[PDB]
Amino acid sequence: SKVTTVVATPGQGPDRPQEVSYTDTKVIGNGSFGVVYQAKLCDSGELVAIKKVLQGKAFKNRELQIMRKLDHCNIVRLRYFFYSSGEKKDEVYLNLVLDYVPETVYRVARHYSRAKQTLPVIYVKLYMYQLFRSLAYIHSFGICHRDIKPQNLLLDPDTAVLKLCDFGSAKQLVRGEPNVSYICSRYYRAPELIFGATDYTSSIDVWSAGCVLAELLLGQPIFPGDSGVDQLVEIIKVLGTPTREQIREMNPNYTEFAFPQIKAHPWTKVFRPRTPPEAIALCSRLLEYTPTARLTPLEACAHSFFDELRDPNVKLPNGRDTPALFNFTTQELSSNPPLATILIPPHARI
Amino acid sequence: SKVTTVVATPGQGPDRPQEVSYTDTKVIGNGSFGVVYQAKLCDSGELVAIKKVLQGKAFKNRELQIMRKLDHCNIVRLRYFFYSSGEKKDEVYLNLVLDYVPETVYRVARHYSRAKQTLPVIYVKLYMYQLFRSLAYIHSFGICHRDIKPQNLLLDPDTAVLKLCDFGSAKQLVRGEPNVSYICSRYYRAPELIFGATDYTSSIDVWSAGCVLAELLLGQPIFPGDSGVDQLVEIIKVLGTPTREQIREMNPNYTEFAFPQIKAHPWTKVFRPRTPPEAIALCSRLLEYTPTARLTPLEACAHSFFDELRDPNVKLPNGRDTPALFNFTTQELSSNPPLATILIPPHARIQA
């Protein structure tokens, strides 16, 4: 087996390059910006994913700069990163050595869906809570993921730990500075994004997250559609007709809105009868037309829907303990410290 | 069998209501704005599709007003249309009785695709040419379809006639008046649409049509992507990097463009080796960043790629004759009359 050895720079640590060797290199994906391999570190034996991307050198790689600044248990970590010339024109490739995670919320959900079933609520709670923590964290740095979707939520079957990945669309959102409106995937795009808003905030991720939650409860996407129109129609069916005010807060000067006057047929009418009221309540507070009205990732973590996770005797179906869910840092709570009162249960520690 | 009878107003004829009876009503679709049925007219026995849509009366139905103004053999015709109260709040429903067509370019393409094959070029020519005529036609009225895609191209297996359908997104585009940028489906959205342009023209349909042509030649969508970003990346791989100028003609003040400097790996490198050079040429002239640089639907019909259709001895594979492809009207040629010189073959000018 071919053993590759390179000199890579640690992810978070000091910028002191080390020698890294890996074997069993195989292609496990072919993304937009490049190919993604899967190798095994000769030392620890651990599995990792290598994402190669064309680097122009004419600029600083935005994804790399964001990844180096992140250190959270619910975020895929950049172990190392190095460069390597390619071909076709002797190009410079940036290789990102990320941790390898088995499943994804996408694959898991599909398993249950095409099995005529729904993911047990315990897992819906565990997964969503971790997604909101990772979101609370990156937002505190002013970083917006801009592409939250089931495929980017890596999962570990045994530990039930969820990690956000794919920061290729992430960006530091600065007030007053324009942001492109063509990011984020289909069923998960927030209304303001569909309306071409260029001055949106991190609240777009919260909407995306609300779409994932809803999808986990329904068994299929809540707002399907091949065009923004079809998507807008599905949203209106559930949320009702956007008031002149709401349409203005979503920004886009589309105050000249041409759509039927359909009022909302309540959320309790959207999900199955067994669906927990709190779960439905959370969606309603997450999927709001007015971006400033949506819960903040931190406020969602403290939502009554996640109270079971704060229960001392909570356990995973497989008998194991839940991952660390209360080891919040000052940085994570910064958007609203007083919330620690709820986020951290009386028994929690770490 | 339940026989329904209603008083419907003819499609284009004088607004003189008539009694229409139909049976065998079954649901054949459940679209965004409503359900689509399929019934059989008791008289002629012909099959039709009824599209019900919620009508607020507070306005004039835009789709209906456009459909009534259209009469082309490559455009689905509105036979009748009537109203009927529904429920849930005693709503008023607008029923559009359109002609019923069997297959769609979408279904046909999928048949070949998941059969490890490609649709014979003869069919690609016949289908694209008719799509460009229908496009040349509605564009002459200033109407932009805004949602051209394989699913909206109805086909008739035997006659090889293609008809454009679904005008629910169509609109009269007036210069200086803003148009929403959230129309058109995923793989077929033109660059300016992805960039959020609000002052686009009918050239967006030409782009969409170029994507259908390329898809018929490749066996799959040419510019896939679940996000505008992913789509933009696929387009850039083929067209290269948009110049500051092109990015400005697409409009959106995104002159501050943040994307790699990838040059284009030629179109001949995109399609299979057997792909006709003319076919590839047409795509290159259809899929342009600058919307004003793209061929017009009428100019495409006159493209060398369609020369076989103008051949006197052209015939369909099943031995039948090709549909009428040269009976152009003044209205259709209005964008450039001199083109009739090519559009109408010498043998089509033989008075006899």
DSSP per-residue string spanning B319-339: SPPPP------HHHHTT-GGG
**Distance to chain A for B57, nearest Cα, Å:** 10
**Distance to chain B for A197, nearest Cα, Å:** 9
CB contact under 8 A, B33 and A233: yes
Give me the DSSP letters along A227-294.
SHHHHHHHHHHHH-PPPHHHHHHS-SS--S-----PPP--GGGTS-TTS-HHHHHHHHHHS-SSGGGS
Helices (runs of H) and strands (runs of E) counted in chain B: 11, 11
Partner residue opposite B183 with nearest CB, options A58, A229, A254: A229
- Interchain contact B93–A (C-beta under 8 A): no
Residue found by looking up tokens 């669309």 in the block:
A169
CB contact under 8 A, A229 and B56: no
Q: Which two tokens stand for residue B332?
A: 């259709």
CA B271 to CA B219: how far, in whole Å?
Answer: 10
CB contact under 8 A, A186 and B33: no
Consult the annotation and say whether B237 binds a ligand.
no
- Interchain contact A36–B (C-beta under 8 A): no
CA B243 to CA B249: how far, in whole Å?
Answer: 10
> Which residue among A43, A71, A147, A199 is the active-site one?
A147
Taking a C-beta distance cutoff of 8 angstroms, is the pair B237, B265 a contact? yes
> Which residue among B24, B147, B199, B230 is the active-site one?
B147
Consult the annotation and say whether B36 binds a ligand.
yes
CB contact under 8 A, B226 and A185: yes
Among candidate residues A149, A129, A100, A119, the one with its CA nearest the CA of residue A324: A129
Taking a C-beta distance cutoff of 8 angstroms, is the pair A163, A76 a contact? yes
Consult the annotation and say whether B31 binds a ligand.
yes
When computed from its CA atoms, the radius of gyration of chain B, rounded to whole angstroms, is 21
Residues of B in contact with A264 (CB under 8 A): none
Compute, in degrees rounded to 10, the torsion defined by CA atoms B196, B199, B202, B205. Answer: 0
Helix (H, G, I), strand (E, B) or coil at A333: helix
Task: Identify the residue among A146, A184, A226, A259 best suited for mutation to test binding to B, counting B beta carbons within 10 A and taking the highest.
Answer: A226
* Known catalytic residue at B307: no
Residues 247-266 of A with CB under 8 A from B: 254, 256, 258, 260-262
Side chain identity, residue A282: L
Say which DSSP state B296 is in: P
Side chain identity, residue A168: G
CA A141 to CA A138: how far, in whole Å?
Answer: 5
CB contact under 8 A, B226 and A254: no
Q: Which residues are bridge partners to A8 per DSSP?
A: A18
CB pairs under 8 A between A and B: 76
Among candidate residues A49, A57, A64, the one with its CA nearest the CA of residue A12: A64
Helix residue ranges per DSSP H, chain B:
62-68, 105-113, 121-140, 191-194, 203-218, 228-239, 244-249, 277-286, 297-301, 330-333, 340-343
CA A347 to CA A211: how far, in whole Å?
Answer: 32
Partner residue opposite A227 with nearest CB, options B58, B183, B227: B183
CB contact under 8 A, A183 and B227: yes
- Nearest residue of B to residue A198 by CA position? B196
Q: Which two tokens stand for residue A11?
A: 């992810």
Residues of A in contact with B227 (CB under 8 A): 147, 169, 182-186
Taking a C-beta distance cutoff of 8 angstroms, is the pair B27, B37 a contact? yes
Compute, in degrees rounded to 10, the torsion defined by CA atoms B127, B129, B132, B136. Answer: -140
**Distance to chain A for B36, nearest Cα, Å:** 16
Q: Which residues have C-beta within 8 Å of that of residue A303, sequence separation ≥ 6?
A: A278, A281, A282, A285, A295
Taking a C-beta distance cutoff of 8 angstroms, is the pair B142, B174 a contact? yes
Taking a C-beta distance cutoff of 8 angstroms, is the pair B22, B4 a contact? yes
- Interchain contact A15–B (C-beta under 8 A): no
CB contact under 8 A, A183 and B58: no
CA A64 to CA A69: how far, in whole Å?
Answer: 9
Map out the domains of chain B with their CATH numbers: 19-102 (3.30.200.20), 103-349 (1.10.510.10)
- Interchain contact A229–B (C-beta under 8 A): yes
CA atoms within 13 A on the CB side of B314: 20
- Nearest residue of B to residue A168 by CA position? B229
Question: Experimental method for this entry?
Answer: X-ray
- Interchain contact B182–A (C-beta under 8 A): yes
Residues of A in contact with B232 (CB under 8 A): 182
CA A264 to CA A275: how far, in whole Å?
Answer: 19
A91 backbone dihedrals φ, ψ, rounded to 5°: -90, 160
- Interchain contact B30–A (C-beta under 8 A): no
- Interchain contact B176–A (C-beta under 8 A): no
- Interchain contact B184–A (C-beta under 8 A): yes
